[model samples]
Target: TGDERFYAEHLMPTLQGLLDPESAHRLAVRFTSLGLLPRARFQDSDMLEVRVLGHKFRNPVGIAAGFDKHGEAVDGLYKMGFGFVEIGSVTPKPQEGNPRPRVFRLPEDQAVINRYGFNSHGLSVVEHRLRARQQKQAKLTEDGLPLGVNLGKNKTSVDAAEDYAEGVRVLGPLADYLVVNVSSPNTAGLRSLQGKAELRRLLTKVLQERDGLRRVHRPAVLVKIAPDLTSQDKEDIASVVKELGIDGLIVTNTTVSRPAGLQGALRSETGGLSGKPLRDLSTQTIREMYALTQGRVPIIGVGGVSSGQDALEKIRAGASLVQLYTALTFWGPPVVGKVKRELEALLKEQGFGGVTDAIGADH
Candidate 1:
């Protein structure tokens, strides 16, 4: 029991301190990929069970993309008690992404800044990894923990939409869900795809390809948006989502804006900011999205989520599910189970039956 909660509070930060942020991340990946991280046994009672996009999650808290960019640790994350684990921002081809010193820490703000771009080993490599994972487990959703892939365009690709469509074609059958990520700030002009027409065209092609999949089950398609959007951006994007009948929405990506009260020098670092600093801004976006969609679109809230209440707040703010990455970078695997416990308790205290019952409660 003590070892379960020991990493974040007692171990991880210090271990990470001895290495640079990117190197530390690589080590974390190695542990998970090697199945060296301690696994937590999950008990998914009715209190934590959630059905979204026709798939049941043991719990609603998922590990966001970027943690396992190449689909290396889906089972590892499941072992760590995540209800779902999203891998990638995987491109159509392998890419080196941004240069070194791209990831920075802001301990004072409990945050991280990264401009890693869409570093990936391309669709073929990840496809093999996903296929291998399924063959080893005899099923992809180990204990109902769905695996997702966040799709991204290559930095050198001339047509971003085609790149995403290719990703959808390559990974659609393997992923429980596929995210069209046009929101990372590190990639130049990538966010421009978030524009209404561009986004619609991109999703249209992706969805078309996804639908054409001959597999028994087609993964749900989701769009990951930016937190830096204006009201008009939200309206236009929401309309496109509604018009195309998108399956779900990941309410945000890391933000380019730095808010006040940051104490760490890395706060001045370039790239999208994530962690505790992203909490309020992302929550606000969640609220706005719920309002604009009138709760019609299923939202996956991600950003600054560390605890059960943070997860709960996202659900109440109209997130059908919540995801964590930066928090796990701080709190480690135990954070997943802890959040599940806290969320269940909070649900009971609020007189709610389960996570599903709390979705959009604030809206």
Candidate 2:
């Protein structure tokens, strides 16, 4: 571990050397592309449980969307220990996000900045992977896991409605659940689609496509929102959820606001910031969306969930389940075991018999 030159030459040059952040991202993407990201494996303990929304979770912790924009190494990631895994913000066609160096890692803040624009490998590639994974799982015993896919529009695409619908229509069958990502800030005017009229229109088309896929293969429908919305924007987004009967909400992606006291390189970059600083903003967003859904649709609370305490905060804030990414990067994979153990202890200490028993325990 005392490889000083390795730290200085390799790590520093890669992370803090004014590097093109997207290069690192694509490196990871390529790793997953070659089917090599670490896997999240589960022991067949009696502790595993079934969930609504068709998720068979060994525990509530999961790898979030951006971690695997395509389904390349999902099996590996799941085997590494994720309870569930979701992939692909794939659109109808491929997208080569913004310019070079669109991603950055801030060790000082334990955070990352990315403006990847949902550069996915497109539906054909992802749907093929999804179908293959489904077949592989079907060929297995109960050891098969839950697989989810996220659907989105191309960065430069004008037909955002059809883009989402097309993505949903094509990949919907191989997914156990599908998340519509309309809140990413990297795409020009993408967040604008979150507004009332546009939100309803986009969701309606995606829902119709999802139902059409249901005739072939039905999967739950969820939405992932941003962390920077105004309270009114949150309320407006919630109204769409209530009216649409959406299945769930993934409470956040990265945020644009600086948390008043944070510092770092990408902290000042012109992109969304993710990690420790995003917790409070996302937690509040989940609260708003949950109230609007009125328990009809559940919330998968995320953002800065580095510890069991943070996970419990979202659970008390009315989240039905939780996920993490930044923490995994910072603390490494066994962090999953820590959070799961801590969460179980937390539930028992709070006199809760199950994970859901502690949901919204704070009112």
Candidate 3:
């Protein structure tokens, strides 16, 4: 544990310094895929465990989407001790995302700005990988590690509903849950799908596809939205979610609006901003959405969560589960254990026996 903290806090920064952000990212993913990282030394306590989306999460702390854009490192990430791991914003067709030099890391702010534009390996490739993974492992759910697949529409595709439906048809059977990611800032016109009318139409199609599946375990579907939204926008989304009985909500993807007082040369980069700067905004969105839906829908709180206290805040704000990505880039694999430990400690301090007791406690 001490060695990991040292490597992550000191040695990893040195390694990251030599390579550009995107290259470093690729290397991390490749190494993880090969299981170069150590398996988790610590075991999850029952206090950190949660059950949501009709499944058990050994811990509420999961690795969010956009980290493994494909299904390459599911096992490796799981070995790092995450309760769940979600992959992709995988589109129906493979496509080159935005041009190079897309990801920018701001060391000073502990933040990153990326416009990778859902540059996915597409559904078929990902589906094949997941299928192989399933065959190799006896059963993922039995392991208490739920695997989620986040789906996105192709950049050139005109019919968004068809794209999402196609994703559900192919990947739903394999996933423990599915996420309709409509919040990425880099994808042109993608956020428009969050509009009330558009959302209703799209989710209706996706759910129909899910219902039509021949498989026994139909995946729970959740929608991920951006932090940058007006009051009315949030209201509309809440209305649509309740009306359609959407399974859950991932409160706030990366934010397009740059918060004031950001430090670093890449601070002005034109993409979604994540990490510490997004922390409060995302938590607030979680609180609002939790209230709007009357706490009926499960919310996966993510964006800039790097510690146990941060995770606890989201839970108090009504998040059933919490996830992290940027924190991993900054704090290394040890962060997962760190967050879980801290959250468990905090929950005890607050006299909350488990995450379920703290859910929406702030309200």
**How far does residue 208 in candidate 3 sit from its true spot (Å)?**
1.0
Assess candidate 1 and give its TM-score to the true structure.
0.96
- lDDT (Cα, tens digit) per residue for candidate 3, span 17-128: 8889899889889989999997777798888878889888888999999989988988898888899999998999999999988999988889999999989999989988
Q: Against the correct fold, how does model 2 do in TM-score?
A: 0.88
lDDT tens digits by residue: candidate 1, 1-363: 365467866687787777899998998888897999875765867678787787878789898889899887677788888888889989999999999999998988889999998899999898888777665533546456777889998888999888988998888887788899988999979889889988888888888888888766588899999999987999999999999999889978999998978997888889999999899888899989999888999999999998878888999999999998888777877888888888888899999977888899896
- Residue 342's C-alpha lDDT in candidate 1? 81
lDDT of 2 by residue, 220-316 (tens): 8888888878778888888998889888889898887877767675578778888888888888877777777776678999898977788888888
TM-scores of the models, in the order given: 0.96, 0.88, 0.98
lDDT per model vs. reference: 0.86, 0.74, 0.90
Candidate 2 at 253: error in angstroms? 1.4
Off by over 4 Å in 1: 1-5, 136-142
Best by TM-score: 3
Q: RMSD in angstroms, candidate 3?
A: 1.2
Looking at model 1, report the run of 10 residues with the lowest lDDT sum: 134-143
Candidate 3 has an lDDT of 0.90
Cα RMSD (angstroms) for every candidate in the order listed: 1.6, 3.8, 1.2
Give the lDDT of residue 240 in candidate 3: 95
User: Of models 1 and 3, which has the larger TM-score?
Assistant: 3
